[PDB]
Design a protein around this nucleic acid. Structure first.
Ligand SMILES: [Mn+2]
Ligand SMILES: [Mn+2]
Ligand SMILES: [Pt+2]
Ligand SMILES: [Pt+2]
Ligand SMILES: [Pt+2]
Ligand SMILES: [Pt+2]
Ligand SMILES: [Pt+2]
Ligand SMILES: [Pt+2]
Ligand SMILES: [Pt+2]
Ligand SMILES: [Pt+2]
Ligand SMILES: [Pt+2]
Ligand SMILES: [Pt+2]
Ligand SMILES: [Pt+2]
Ligand SMILES: [Pt+2]
Ligand SMILES: [Pt+2]
Ligand SMILES: [Pt+2]
Ligand SMILES: [Pt+2]
Ligand SMILES: [Pt+2]
Ligand SMILES: [Pt+2]
Ligand SMILES: [Pt+2]
Ligand SMILES: [Pt+2]
Ligand SMILES: [Pt+2]
Ligand SMILES: [Pt+2]
Ligand SMILES: [Pt+2]
Ligand SMILES: [Pt+2]
Ligand SMILES: [Pt+2]
Ligand SMILES: [Pt+2]
Ligand SMILES: [Pt+2]
Ligand SMILES: [Pt+2]
Ligand SMILES: [Pt+2]
Ligand SMILES: [Pt+2]
Lengths: 94, 97, 105, 78, 103, 99, 83, 98
DNA sequence: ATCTCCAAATATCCCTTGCGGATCGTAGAAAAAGTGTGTCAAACTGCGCTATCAAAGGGAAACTTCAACTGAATTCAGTTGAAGTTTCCCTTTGATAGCGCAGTTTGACACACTTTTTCTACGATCCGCAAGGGATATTTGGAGAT
DNA sequence: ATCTCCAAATATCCCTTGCGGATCGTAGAAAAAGTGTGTCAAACTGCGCTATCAAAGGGAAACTTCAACTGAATTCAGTTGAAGTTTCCCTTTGATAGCGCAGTTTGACACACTTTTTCTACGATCCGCAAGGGATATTTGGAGAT
């Protein structure tokens, strides 16, 4: 059966950032854990936010304030900006 | 009549460990909260219970912190708590790098 | 442009993130931009770690990233260290560090 | 404002904490430590307020903020 | 009521509603709210039991937060369960370190 | 009328009932009631939270009394775990009796 | 066959080595049994939870995931074995 | 015959073990311990070898971190030698019990 | 101050492997497009509760007086844990085979969910009365002095 | 070790207010009914876990020697605590002014659902080869010795 993984995306981002550099299988498993982990923490807190505010839906707004709550200062600033920038770009098409 | 150093302190411990009343005066604490919230967002109000919450949390936190600090003091064959004690407690708590 | 990632200008997979939000009972409904926003955040954070681990690989005369590089990266970085404050990187070891008093005198 | 948390108040806290003798430098440290604690909780509390499009910091906002820092508080709307 | 069919004080219907509104899963089995209501009942029974005695020991007919604090912190298992909880207005257990006492 | 003053909802009545069952001559202040209400919610969430994950972990769509059971076993320390598993198993036995 | 006294396989040199990784220069002779104590408590807690995850799944084999989930529960998330 | 002064080898062992990332407890002993403990909870359990490797990674991480805290406690008391009361202090302040 | 020497680091050769970059063929999942519908944004409204104000006294915080006792520095010796040596147990490694059981598959369906009507538990709101608060006295449990 | 001397504990009595019971009205739970799909039980399977053996040698255990660390003992300057005096502001009380929270009604729209079309990502398999990684030898930086 299919084992889903973030491996391909992590390679892609790795080539953008350090184009002559590889990653061991274990190092990748760690990367995959990290992505699943952060995902869980964000979706999780976003879930609460919608509940706390009697909403049926998780929007990019919940993700944003989830991010602000979970990530420490600078990392929250850039991720917030990468986030909004991608949504902005994403509405701009279709 | 003079009680020796430490005797009244001991008495105080018994007294404060027996009550549950807040030990920071309400208003100075309230000012501090609004000042701090101000540095995060301007034009903000507070449900009175919210301030209460913050004070309950804050004192429970500090009391607990003093228990830990005191243990570190005693670990060093001392009886007097010093900043190095708080610093160690907070490090071992993983509150501080 | 077909894929939602391509639309959003992203490497991380917007469709996958959408599906995982739906089948994870976080809420009844998932808005259009949430997986976009979320895939972007995930991509960013992996870029920041790969970057920092990448450097660590190079400082140790190495070409391929291993868990020790991720660990060096994370704990030498005040902010990643905080985010993964309660996390254990298998095979990462620890930071070299010997308290002063133990040094020969 | 930070000095509204007075030497006698801090002593009182230290007593509930079981502390018999306090070095003179403690009162400054405690103010520093208390600032960092309030900063973090209120940072989160206000984030919840903003998100709810409100201008009022609620008890719940705080209770939620205290919950995120792993400091669940009973008695205000848990 | 489902509560009576199960011999519980705690509301099996509410617990059931609340499990549907919390997005814990797509579906909720019939047994689950009963079992949960029961556990919630037993646990509040447990606290109140020790809290009450602490009201007694303190010569009172009303439980106040301080008695809940004494109940919880004097009981090893409840102290573990509420390890990361602060009971407002609870104070602390009287505890003074040996070496701080005079000879 | 017409404009209704919302509607809060707590466990205060069932708690008071249980207080009777164990301390018939003993009462409860409103603040201590608040605390008990928090306690029930807190525990409720901790439990349903685990059960949800157990269902996810096991690729299953339903929260059954079986997930509640192991959630309790993960959540509660030794003796409490044991008693809660009794109290819960029994109510289900009794509930499925009654028709 | 009966399993007994295996905490003694956690040897003195192996405890010495971990203290080194943790920066410890000098070790009192009493540390080895304190460490065994602590390790045992640590393992009982994680293993109890992993085994509960196994039983819940109606499995007889404890998996990496039961352990990873068990560690997560104790606030000791582990990266490198799934999840 | 040559002799290093006490502490010199201890310091170099620290550099050595601080550079590496290999498990420091022997592998089969550790596995017997896990099986013994599991068994006291349920008989007839089997383990994926990676379930065991995971347990070992977590256990060595925990103990290593605990020794860092223990050392800080020894140093706090003007000592260079870790002692049971150091570990006890660390564990107490960590909120670890039993 | 200078030489001796030991263990970590550097250099040499060989070689296994696990990686990145292919090319592949292919289930499963995302996108595309159509349609049904409920969530939530808006706009308008009431009033709950937060802010604020003005005062007045009573107790808390601040400052001061003093010296008891604590922490910090010094000294030293018995203890004890580090280094190095020697013996040989038992872990590691590599391959084997047998099979227990994890995981995939398939039909039958009980059981949950959904929709609508009927019944009732529980929240809102109300305040008499006793458990508790607050004030004063009297008993008791200890500390400091001689 | 026994006698004066505070301060907290306990005893008592009169006020205060929030417990806790009762009244009333609804929103939510229960009952009854039609629909389907997730779960379960049963059949079949081969990854990989346990089990073993067997050789090899790396590492643990047990031992001797002794350097140096812990901690006991001692001294004392000075930082705290206790008690008194002094200065300052917290808390309480009575509202009134209106901010902004939350209730209500609604229809445009955004997301759910489902079906068909398109193509991403996974599992299987091979390759160049630099990167390691292990066995063997040498050079090296400095602890310790003369
Ligand atoms: Mn009873
Ligand atoms: Mn056993
Ligand atoms: Pt709330
Ligand atoms: Pt998994
Ligand atoms: Pt590969
Ligand atoms: Pt297909
Ligand atoms: Pt459409
Ligand atoms: Pt509609
Ligand atoms: Pt208005
Ligand atoms: Pt008004
Ligand atoms: Pt005045
Ligand atoms: Pt006055
Ligand atoms: Pt005065
Ligand atoms: Pt001293
Ligand atoms: Pt000596
Ligand atoms: Pt010895
Ligand atoms: Pt076979
Ligand atoms: Pt009374
Ligand atoms: Pt007396
Ligand atoms: Pt109605
Ligand atoms: Pt209704
Ligand atoms: Pt079906
Ligand atoms: Pt088979
Ligand atoms: Pt050998
Ligand atoms: Pt050897
Ligand atoms: Pt010393
Ligand atoms: Pt002096
Ligand atoms: Pt008004
Ligand atoms: Pt409408
Ligand atoms: Pt040299
Ligand atoms: Pt030298």
């Amino acid at each position: 059966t299919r084992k889903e993984s973030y491996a391909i995306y992590v390679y892609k981002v790795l080539k953008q950032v350090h184009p002559d550099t590889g990653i061991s299988s274990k190092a990748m498993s760690i990367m995959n854990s990290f992505v699943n982990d952060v995902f869980e923490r964000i979706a999780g807190e976003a879930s609460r936010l919608a509940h706390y505010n009697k909403r049926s839906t998780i929007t990019s707004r919940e993700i944003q304030t989830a991010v602000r709550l979970l990530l420490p200062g600078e990392l929250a600033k850039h991720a917030v900006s990468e986030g909004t920038k991608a949504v902005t770009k994403y509405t701009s098409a279709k | 009549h003079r009680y020796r150093p430490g005797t009244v302190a001991l008495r105080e411990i018994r007294r404060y460990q027996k009550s549950t009343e807040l030990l920071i005066r309400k208003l100075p604490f309230q000012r501090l909260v609004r000042e701090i919230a101000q540095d995060f967002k301007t034009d903000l109000r507070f449900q009175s219970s919210a301030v209460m919450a913050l004070q309950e949390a804050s004192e429970a936190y500090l009391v607990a912190l003093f228990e830990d600090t005191n243990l570190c003091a005693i670990h060093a064959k001392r009886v007097t708590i010093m900043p190095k004690d708080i610093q160690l407690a907070r490090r071992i708590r993983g509150e501080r790098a | 442009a077909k894929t939602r990632s391509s639309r959003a200008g992203l490497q991380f997979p917007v469709g996958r993130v959408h599906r995982l939000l739906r089948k994870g009972n976080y809420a009844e409904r998932v808005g259009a931009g949430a997986p976009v926003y979320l895939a972007a955040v995930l991509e960013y954070l992996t870029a920041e770690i790969l970057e920092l681990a990448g450097n660590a690989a190079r400082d140790n005369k190495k070409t391929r990233i291993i868990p020790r590089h991720l660990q060096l990266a994370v704990r030498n970085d005040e902010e990643l260290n905080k985010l993964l404050g309660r996390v254990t990187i298998a095979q990462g070891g620890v930071l070299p560090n010997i308290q002063s008093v133990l040094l020969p005198k | 404002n930070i000095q509204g948390i007075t030497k006698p108040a801090i002593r009182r806290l230290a007593r509930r904490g079981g502390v018999k003798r306090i070095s003179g430098l403690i009162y400054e440290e405690t103010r520093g430590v208390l600032k960092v604690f309030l900063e973090n909780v209120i940072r989160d509390a206000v984030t919840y307020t903003e998100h709810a499009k409100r201008k009022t910091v609620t008890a719940m906002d705080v209770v939620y903020a205290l919950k995120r820092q792993g400091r669940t508080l009973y008695g205000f709307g848990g």
